Design a protein around this ligand. Sequence first.
Ligand SMILES: Cc1cc2nc3c(=O)[nH]c(=O)nc-3n(C[C@H](O)[C@H](O)[C@H](O)COP(=O)(O)OP(=O)(O)OC[C@H]3O[C@@H](n4cnc5c(N)ncnc54)[C@H](O)[C@@H]3O)c2cc1C
Length: 473
Amino acid sequence: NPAHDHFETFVQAQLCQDVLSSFQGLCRALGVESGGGLSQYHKIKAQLNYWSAKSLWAKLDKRASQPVYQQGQACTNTKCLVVGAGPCGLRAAVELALLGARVVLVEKRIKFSRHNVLHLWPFTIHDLRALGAAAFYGRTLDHISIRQLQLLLLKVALLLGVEIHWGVKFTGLQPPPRKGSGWRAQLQPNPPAQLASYEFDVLISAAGGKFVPEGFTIREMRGKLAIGITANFVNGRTVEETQVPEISGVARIYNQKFFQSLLKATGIDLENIVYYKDETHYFVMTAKKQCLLRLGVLRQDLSETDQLLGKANVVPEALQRFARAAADFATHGKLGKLEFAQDARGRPDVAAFDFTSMMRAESSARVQEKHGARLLLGLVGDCLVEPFWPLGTGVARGFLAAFDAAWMVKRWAEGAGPLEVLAERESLYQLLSQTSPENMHRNVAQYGLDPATRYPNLNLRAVTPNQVQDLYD
Ligand SMILES: Cc1cc2nc3c(=O)[nH]c(=O)nc-3n(C[C@H](O)[C@H](O)[C@H](O)COP(=O)(O)OP(=O)(O)OC[C@H]3O[C@@H](n4cnc5c(N)ncnc54)[C@H](O)[C@@H]3O)c2cc1C
């Protein structure tokens, strides 16, 4: 059955292009238009009540029917543009969809190429499971690679009728030229008329570490130099490979004299290491600069980290030897001969990163108004709070920011004043950089958009309308 086959292909799909073609073939076969909101979702499921698909819709329905969404009517007025199909962009898109809003998302890339592996807090694991994650991804389960989290959330966003455009870069805004017009987006390359003319009152920016819209202030604090190295090796799925335990973190304190043993044998002095067994064997480690220079990884000692870890300063062969030697030792050689996975552009998949300079945006939202047309803008994900990767806070905190932005859009749609919406968002924002599974609500099954289910003794007035006046205009 060819609607069934397209749906089956869509579910099982493992390349961004393959998700898109099978989903389009599904829409064609069922006579529906993609990007058609919750109505699309209802029409698709009504045609696919066939048992195999049944538990998928039962989970998505159970989510959609949560009181907070008002059955897809809360934001039925609202038209959003989401920048970025990273995990946190798709996740915010899905919450916006379930609220009833029209949602268009633009992504500069045309594939999901990142293999690095991300740690998941308990709440996010339940969150994903609750979204049909088991039907979408066959494959311990406390971590997930970037691209598989993207494929999963892409298929959810698509079913829920989010309209997504690829190989399009958000470059800023076209303000209302006068009374009666809305906000539009500047886009590269020169967009088709459909996107050129799309007007929205909500912009959610989830463009990652290196982009926020004009008007946002970012805070950069630079601490003690830390240099991170990530590597992905091919994971054949040999029984032997499968039996090698993961290494949850190690470090000084923690699980220490391991680093004693590593240095002798190898000459590698590390601050931390982590091994995740996933689609690849992934390692992340923090290495002393002295040590990277001593072992030929960095070719000289530059004071500016962005130069220190630049292409010109990093030696590919030395970097590869270092990471393989470290990975082999941590695993006691039981992974066999390690082969580097071959990377977004065909290179061996190892790299060095600035683990030191940690941005935090000054606000999570702003409002811009012109000729009587208001635009609400919200940041979500790495562009709001940059994560320190070995501590595993990226997904968790990007997802919380996505719920908190969606809650704010709910409020916006309900008619609260811009200052009221902004002050309440910013009271939530004050908690973000200290959140932990320990200081949040413990029953993660009951987490939903309403922040009271997520943050205990919540204070939505921590920030006042006057404290946010400079965020409005
Ligand atoms: C090279 C790389 C490696 C990483 N490795 C790790 C790791 O090993 N461990 C870990 O914990 N975290 C890692 N991270 C961070 C981790 O991926 C993020 O915490 C997580 O994906 C959530 O990020 P996000 O959705 O906010 O942003 P991202 O994942 O950065 O996604 C941003 C999305 O926006 C798109 N985009 C950017 N600019 C525009 C524009 N102007 N218009 C349209 N689209 C745009 C990007 O193409 C991207 O698809 C890595 C990030 C990168 C970029």
